[PDB]
């Protein structure tokens, strides 16, 4: 008897979200192989690649949209895998998915709430993070539902200069 | 006297491996599925005799854990296993004896002798998806060196208190012997 | 030419050092293979093994005890990998730490701050390790530096009652 | 018109390459190493003509990252690569054709070709560990598909600049034919 790929659990868990998040990438070789749906959503909408990039596994990640995984996928929040990413400041995961794409990629992309990957970067203030994105064409005047544009939402003066250093 | 067990739970995906610990240690069940992420752990106190009691490492094994590399290492060192299938599910007893030679394949007792590993036909609430009968267990056990099986319910507390005590058992015989 | 698992950048890095912050696992094989020191320690006194349990790589955590690394090494703040995993709520990593060792697992080893690990996660009230620790023999008496036990380092009330119930 | 090439920098460990795309692209040096964890990136954009521009994505690919499983993955679609060797490291040089060997291995241009590599003698503001000659590594990049060769200083910024136009050169010369 052989693997199940298309097994869920109640919160919608297939193998390859627990593959992710644990981080065994042979495994994912694996599952993917045997035809695991690499864009499987769960419960909440988050995709192996949502997980990863919470977690911050770079291996992972690339991995997954070597695999031909969609960056972008939004969960119930309306977070990109980025949008996770940046949030919790996995720089080395944000600029896989930066880089990755070749240029096929949007940074303009808002949540539930409004906000691009920018602004939260800014708000928890992540400095190589907002480099990297700003570095990649990221707006600086995209505003949220607050209209708060991403400088707004700047954590100190130390970030705030960084941002303005390109406007 | 006290003691200090490693005991593995290991066995397919859905199959129970997780609600059986979970009764067994906490006696709660939830229908709810939520599947095990790599390998997830439980202890569990006996007082045995009045001379000696028993501390039980539970040692809750993902069912896809078998697909990966890391079984190796977490069987190391295991003195007793129970192996469980879904006795509504006739894949997961097919699959029983890819985990026994994965078990057996991977450690010995310190004399190079196979583990005690008892068997679990779980969720016994519910229907047959199989007609095999106890007999047929009986002469599968003896075959494939397993000390034995229940058949168990985690929803309705069957048969766990009794098959734990009987693999302790298996394990105390080979501990001063 | 074959690799030098001895190799240090000027922050007191190994390659194991990096495989296991990545998580990949096969290459913590194929390093400890070729004679990777696994209780190496980076320039603030960090193990491999501190850094899969920050990380909370459960995997690679058990691969690395499995390879026979040291749960009780202290950072430079008085950390071991389990101080780290309790600060970080990684339960899956707490418990490997706990359950591994078979019972030669030290509960009680303070901190720079005299915290033990309970401390850490009373403070940070991370429920599911809290019971794991309590269920394993952690001390609720135990206090830190500041005199305070983990009773009083609890967030909530809800968790305050958890720790009684033992007590 | 405006391009988007994805350019691989690749080598053994300590050799320089984080250095020189540093250099490149921020005109900064430290001595201080500190090891890639995995891959580094960065852009790099050129005013080629007044007619073309050209956004270079550069692939820093740790040293270590060849014992492991992934560089099948970071080589995808890449358009060109830098090979790169410590001066001052003979191992380092040795090695050159073992990243050369994976990367053919795993990539080809769109025409079953291989892509095009320039091979860089870093560290040249230092003392030659070996006594190799010019015209021996001359002759060394004729052998093994090398386009090119330079000895760049990432610490005096050396030839980096040439070696990059170099790449995109022949990079451009594959994508107009
Ligand atoms: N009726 C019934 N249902 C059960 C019994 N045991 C488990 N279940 C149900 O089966 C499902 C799977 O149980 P669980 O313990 O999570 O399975 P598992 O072996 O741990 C699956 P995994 O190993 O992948 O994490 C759960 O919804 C549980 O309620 C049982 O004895 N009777
Ligand atoms: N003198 C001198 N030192 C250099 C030069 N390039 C790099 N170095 C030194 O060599 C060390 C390694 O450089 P680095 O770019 O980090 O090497 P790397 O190839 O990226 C090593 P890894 O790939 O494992 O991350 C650094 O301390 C750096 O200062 C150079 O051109 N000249
Ligand atoms: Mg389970
Ligand atoms: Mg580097």
Same mark, same amino acid.
């Given at each position: ?167 | ?10 066995? /397919? ?5 997780? #609600?059986?610990?979970?009764?067994? !240690? =906490? ?7 939520? $599947? ?57 007893? /097919? ?5 026994? #030679?994965?078990?057996?394949?991977? !450690? =010995? ?7 005690? $590993? ?60």
């Amino acid at each position: 008897s052989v693997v199940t790929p298309f097994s869920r659990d109640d919160r919608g868990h297939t193998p390859l979200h627990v593959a992710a998040v644990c981080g065994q990438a042979s495994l994912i070789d694996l599952l993917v192989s045997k035809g695991a749906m690499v864009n499987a959503t769960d419960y909440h909408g988050a995709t192996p690649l949502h997980l990863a990039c919470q977690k911050g596994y770079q291996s992972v990640t690339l991995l997954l949209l070597h695999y031909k995984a969609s960056a972008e996928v939004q969960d119930n929040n309306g977070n990109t895998p980025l949008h996770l990413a940046c949030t919790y400041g996995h720089e080395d995961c944000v600029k896989a998915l930066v880089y990755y794409d070749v240029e096929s990629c949007r940074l303009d992309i808002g949540n539930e709430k409004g906000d691009t990957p920018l602004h939260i970067a800014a708000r928890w203030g992540y400095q190589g993070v907002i480099e990297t994105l700003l570095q990649n064409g990221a707006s600086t005047e995209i505003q949220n539902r607050l209209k708060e544009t991403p400088l707004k939402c700047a954590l100190n003066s130390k970030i705030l200069s960084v941002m303005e250093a390109y406007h | 006297r006290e003691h200090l067990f490693k005991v593995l739970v290991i066995g /397919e995906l859905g199959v129970g491996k997780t #609600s059986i610990i979970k009764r067994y !240690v =906490h006696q709660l069940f939830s229908q709810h599925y939520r $599947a095990t992420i790599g390998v997830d752990f439980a202890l569990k106190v006996l007082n045995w005799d009045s001379r000696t009691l028993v501390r039980l490492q539970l040692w809750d094994i993902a069912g896809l854990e078998r697909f990966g590399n890391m079984t190796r290492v977490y069987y190391k060192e295991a003195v007793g296993a129970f192996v469980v299938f879904d006795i509504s599910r006739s894949s997961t007893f /097919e699959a029983v004896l890819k985990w026994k #030679s994965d078990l057996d394949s991977k !450690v =010995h007792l310190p004399n190079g002798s196979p583990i005690p $590993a008892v068997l679990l036909a779980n969720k016994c609430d519910q229907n047959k998806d199989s007609s095999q009968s106890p007999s047929q267990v009986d002469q599968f056990c003896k075959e494939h060196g397993f000390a034995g099986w229940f058949e168990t319910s985690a929803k309705d507390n069957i048969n766990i208190e009794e098959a734990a005590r009987f693999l302790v058992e298996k394990i105390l015989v080979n501990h001063q012997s």
